[PDB]
């Protein structure tokens, strides 16, 4: 009830998926409202806060997001002190002018911003109704850095696909 709007079960479903495929708990995913998302001033979603040395088949989550009520979001990944987060916009972001995109592995700065969506994956590879894009983050303090990877596959990611069903449909 405020300057973001999600329906009672819809955020709870997307937040449930977010803790379940990051394989962390509901008090270990950090959620945030207006202060990072308010540049669409009445609607958005929230932010989700993420751990080091962790992988997910990221496009399984993009797919679940857009399929839930017929409305799409960009995942805007905002790197800050120690944490990765993804700031989730059903929305219009302020830093979209100067934040980045990747498909590769690279070093990434401690106060940085980056969008990854179905339109961005479509610029950087021919997309398909079968993509499993894959994403991997580390924090470091000894290097005062992030270490970021995201890579684009079709159904060839069949091993990680099976391993994820073998965790998340096996809780």
Coordinates of C-alpha atoms in Angstrom, one line a residue:
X1 CA 0.0 0.0 0.0
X2 CA 2.2 2.8 -1.3
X3 CA 4.4 3.9 -4.4
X4 CA 5.0 0.3 -5.5
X5 CA 2.0 -2.0 -6.5
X6 CA 2.1 -5.8 -6.5
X7 CA -0.9 -7.9 -5.7
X8 CA -0.9 -10.0 -2.4
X9 CA 0.2 -13.4 -3.9
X10 CA 2.3 -12.2 -6.9
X11 CA 5.3 -10.6 -5.1
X12 CA 5.2 -13.6 -2.6
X13 CA 5.4 -16.0 -5.6
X14 CA 8.4 -14.1 -7.3
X15 CA 10.2 -13.7 -3.9
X16 CA 9.5 -17.4 -3.1
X17 CA 11.2 -18.3 -6.5
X18 CA 14.0 -15.8 -5.8
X19 CA 15.1 -17.4 -2.4
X20 CA 14.5 -20.9 -3.9
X21 CA 16.8 -20.6 -7.0
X22 CA 19.4 -18.4 -5.1
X23 CA 19.2 -21.3 -2.5
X24 CA 19.0 -18.9 0.4
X25 CA 16.2 -18.3 3.0
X26 CA 13.4 -15.6 3.3
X27 CA 15.4 -13.6 5.9
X28 CA 18.6 -13.9 3.8
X29 CA 17.1 -12.5 0.6
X30 CA 16.9 -8.8 1.3
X31 CA 13.8 -7.0 -0.1
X32 CA 13.6 -3.2 -0.6
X33 CA 10.8 -0.8 -1.6
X34 CA 10.6 2.8 -3.1
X35 CA 14.1 4.2 -2.2
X36 CA 15.9 2.3 -5.1
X37 CA 12.9 1.8 -7.5
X38 CA 10.7 4.9 -7.3
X39 CA 11.5 6.3 -10.9
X40 CA 8.4 4.6 -12.0
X41 CA 6.4 6.6 -9.3
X42 CA 3.3 4.3 -8.7
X43 CA 4.4 0.7 -9.7
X44 CA 7.6 -1.4 -9.9
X45 CA 8.4 -4.4 -7.8
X46 CA 11.2 -4.3 -5.2
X47 CA 14.9 -5.4 -4.9
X48 CA 16.4 -8.8 -4.1
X49 CA 19.8 -9.3 -2.4
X50 CA 22.3 -11.9 -3.4
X51 CA 25.3 -14.0 -2.1
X52 CA 28.9 -14.7 -3.3
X53 CA 30.0 -18.0 -5.0
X54 CA 26.4 -18.7 -6.4
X55 CA 25.0 -19.7 -9.8
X56 CA 21.4 -19.8 -11.3
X57 CA 19.9 -20.5 -14.8
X58 CA 18.7 -16.9 -14.8
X59 CA 16.3 -17.0 -17.7
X60 CA 14.1 -19.7 -16.0
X61 CA 13.4 -16.8 -13.5
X62 CA 12.9 -14.1 -16.2
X63 CA 10.4 -16.6 -17.8
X64 CA 8.5 -17.2 -14.5
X65 CA 8.4 -13.4 -13.8
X66 CA 6.8 -12.4 -17.2
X67 CA 4.4 -15.5 -17.2
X68 CA 2.9 -14.7 -13.6
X69 CA 0.3 -12.0 -14.6
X70 CA 1.3 -10.9 -18.1
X71 CA 3.6 -8.0 -17.3
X72 CA 7.4 -7.8 -17.9
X73 CA 10.4 -6.6 -15.8
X74 CA 14.1 -5.7 -16.3
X75 CA 16.6 -7.1 -13.8
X76 CA 18.7 -4.1 -12.9
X77 CA 21.7 -5.4 -10.9
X78 CA 23.0 -2.8 -8.5
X79 CA 26.4 -3.7 -7.0
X80 CA 27.0 -1.8 -3.7
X81 CA 29.5 -2.3 -0.7
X82 CA 29.4 -5.9 0.2
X83 CA 26.4 -7.4 -1.6
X84 CA 25.1 -8.0 -5.1
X85 CA 21.5 -7.1 -5.5
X86 CA 19.0 -7.1 -8.4
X87 CA 16.7 -4.1 -8.3
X88 CA 13.5 -5.3 -10.1
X89 CA 11.6 -2.8 -12.3
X90 CA 8.1 -3.2 -13.6
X91 CA 9.4 0.2 -14.4
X92 CA 11.6 3.1 -15.6
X93 CA 15.1 3.4 -13.8
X94 CA 17.1 6.6 -13.1
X95 CA 20.7 5.4 -14.0
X96 CA 19.6 3.5 -17.3
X97 CA 21.5 6.3 -19.1
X98 CA 24.9 5.2 -17.7
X99 CA 24.5 1.6 -16.2
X100 CA 25.8 -1.4 -18.4
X101 CA 25.1 -4.9 -20.0
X102 CA 27.3 -8.1 -20.4
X103 CA 27.5 -11.4 -21.9
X104 CA 31.0 -12.6 -20.8
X105 CA 32.9 -12.9 -17.6
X106 CA 34.6 -9.7 -16.2
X107 CA 35.8 -7.6 -13.2
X108 CA 32.9 -5.2 -12.1
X109 CA 33.1 -2.1 -9.8
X110 CA 31.8 -1.8 -6.2
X111 CA 29.1 0.9 -6.9
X112 CA 27.9 -0.2 -10.4
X113 CA 24.6 -0.9 -12.2
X114 CA 23.6 -3.3 -15.1
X115 CA 20.3 -4.4 -17.0
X116 CA 19.7 -7.9 -18.3
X117 CA 16.3 -8.6 -20.0
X118 CA 14.9 -10.6 -22.9
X119 CA 15.5 -7.6 -25.2
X120 CA 19.2 -7.3 -24.1
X121 CA 19.8 -11.1 -24.5
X122 CA 18.2 -10.7 -28.0
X123 CA 20.8 -7.9 -28.9
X124 CA 23.8 -10.0 -27.8
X125 CA 22.6 -13.5 -29.0
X126 CA 19.7 -14.8 -31.3
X127 CA 17.1 -15.7 -28.6
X128 CA 14.8 -18.8 -28.6
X129 CA 11.7 -20.2 -26.7
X130 CA 14.2 -22.6 -25.0
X131 CA 17.1 -20.3 -23.6
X132 CA 18.7 -21.1 -20.3
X133 CA 21.0 -18.1 -19.7
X134 CA 23.3 -18.8 -16.8
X135 CA 24.7 -16.3 -14.2
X136 CA 27.5 -16.4 -11.5
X137 CA 28.7 -13.7 -9.0
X138 CA 31.5 -13.2 -6.5
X139 CA 32.3 -10.5 -3.9
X140 CA 35.9 -9.9 -2.9
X141 CA 37.4 -7.6 -0.1
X142 CA 41.1 -8.5 -0.7
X143 CA 40.5 -7.2 -4.3
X144 CA 37.8 -4.6 -3.4
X145 CA 35.8 -5.9 -6.4
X146 CA 33.0 -7.9 -8.0
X147 CA 33.7 -10.8 -10.3
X148 CA 30.7 -11.2 -12.7
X149 CA 29.8 -13.9 -15.3
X150 CA 26.7 -14.4 -17.4
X151 CA 26.5 -16.6 -20.5
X152 CA 23.8 -17.6 -22.9
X153 CA 22.7 -21.2 -23.7
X154 CA 19.7 -23.0 -25.3
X155 CA 18.6 -26.5 -24.1
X156 CA 22.3 -27.6 -24.0
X157 CA 22.4 -26.4 -20.3
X158 CA 20.5 -29.8 -19.6
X159 CA 22.8 -30.8 -16.7
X160 CA 22.2 -27.6 -14.6
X161 CA 18.5 -27.8 -15.6
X162 CA 18.3 -31.3 -14.1
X163 CA 20.3 -30.3 -11.0
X164 CA 18.0 -27.4 -10.3
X165 CA 14.8 -29.5 -10.6
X166 CA 16.7 -31.9 -8.3
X167 CA 17.0 -29.2 -5.6
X168 CA 13.9 -26.9 -6.1
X169 CA 11.2 -29.5 -7.0
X170 CA 13.0 -31.6 -4.3
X171 CA 12.5 -29.4 -1.2

